[PDB]
Amino acid sequence: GKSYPTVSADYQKAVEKAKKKLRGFIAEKRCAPLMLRLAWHSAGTFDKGTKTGGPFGTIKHPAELAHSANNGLDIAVRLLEPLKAEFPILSYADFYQLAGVVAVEVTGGPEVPFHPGREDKPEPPPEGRLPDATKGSDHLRDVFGKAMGLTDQDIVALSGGHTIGAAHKERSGFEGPWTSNPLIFDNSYFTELLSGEKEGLLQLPSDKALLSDPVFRPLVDKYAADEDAFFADYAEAHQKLSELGFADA
Numbered sequence: 001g002k003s004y005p006t007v008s009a010d011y012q013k014a015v016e017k018a019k020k021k022l023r024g025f026i027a028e029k030r031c032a033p034l035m036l037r038l039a040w041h042s043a044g045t046f047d048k049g050t051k052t053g054g055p056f057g058t059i060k061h062p063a064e065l066a067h068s069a070n071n072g073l074d075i076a077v078r079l080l081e082p083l084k085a086e087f088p089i090l091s092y093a094d095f096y097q098l099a100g101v102v103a104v105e106v107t108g109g110p111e112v113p114f115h116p117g118r119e120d121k122p123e124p125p126p127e128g129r130l131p132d133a134t135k136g137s138d139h140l141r142d143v144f145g146k147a148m149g150l151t152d153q154d155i156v157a158l159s160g161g162h163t164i165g166a167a168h169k170e171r172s173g174f175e176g177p178w179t180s181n182p183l184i185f186d187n188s189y190f191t192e193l194l195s196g197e198k199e200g201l202l203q204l205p206s207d208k209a210l211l212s213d214p215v216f217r218p219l220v221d222k223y224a225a226d227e228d229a230f231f232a233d234y235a236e237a238h239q240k241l242s243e244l245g246f247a248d249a
């Protein structure tokens with residue numbers, strides 16, 4: 001149900017040039033996981049029933065950055081501002097989602113389709129809509145399904161974004177990477193989840209909830225066995241996430 005807006009030729013040219021500059025910048029700074037978390041936290045506030053929140057540029061506002069869920073994301077916003085300023089025609093909304101898409105690509109993930117046109121909105125959404133790492137499946141469905149409107153399949157594939165990156169005790173309070181290759185986008189998140197607790201590697205209660213839910217567990221198993229299946233479902237879910245509320249909800 002998407003109808004993407006028309007943008008001018010100059011806008012499309014800047015998207016293409018921004019995409020290339022973002023690859024070099026994100027690869028150089030080794031910040032792909034942080035930029036994916038910035039894109040996701042930008043989009044993950046969407047509430048379908050009210051059409052509030054979502055990927056509309058509000059996370060750079062200090063009021064949204066101050067949310068505890070966003071601890072550390074001010075680094076990301078600061079890191080991107082010089083590059084953003086080279087593309088004044090792009091919305092911050094599109095810029096941050098483009099950074100998320102590129103973060104996945106440059107770590108070796110699928111190519112997530114990207115459509116421009118998001119407008120920057122003035123009001124951040126209320127705090128408290130992003131998922132709580134200490135809760136379980138019922139909570140995940142409340143947040144991804146009843147608020148955002150995404151599917152159970154989308155929940156498991158998007159959880160796989162933890163295949164890159166790490167937690168930090170001074171940000172969430174959790175600490176360490178989910179995988180042994182945290183700058184490589186692959187299905188290792190699911191293979192670690194299945195294998196048990198390995199020393200040095202992180203599992204949140206929200207990751208573990210995937211193993212005991214009757215719908216989520218068959219997906220974890222599919223993704224652990226079939227990385228190509230993981231990439232297809234990942235790319236579908238990330239595109240949907242990045243487009244919540246945009247070009248028809």
Ligand code: HEM
Pocket residue numbers: 032033034036037040072131132133134140158159160161162164165166167168169171172173174204206
């Ligand atoms: C399923 C519900 C989820 C919960 C409860 C959750 C929770 C967390 C927490 C607590 C952290 C650690 C932050 C820190 O201390 O630095 C984290 C990091 C991260 N999250 Fe999630 N997350 C969820 C879903 C997602 C999704 C849907 C994506 C994107 C597809 C994503 C991508 C990441 C990435 C890449 C990091 C690493 C950031 C870094 O390395 O700095 N997560 N998440």
Ligand SMILES: [K+]
Pocket residue numbers: 163164179180181182183184185186188189
């Ligand atoms: K990995």
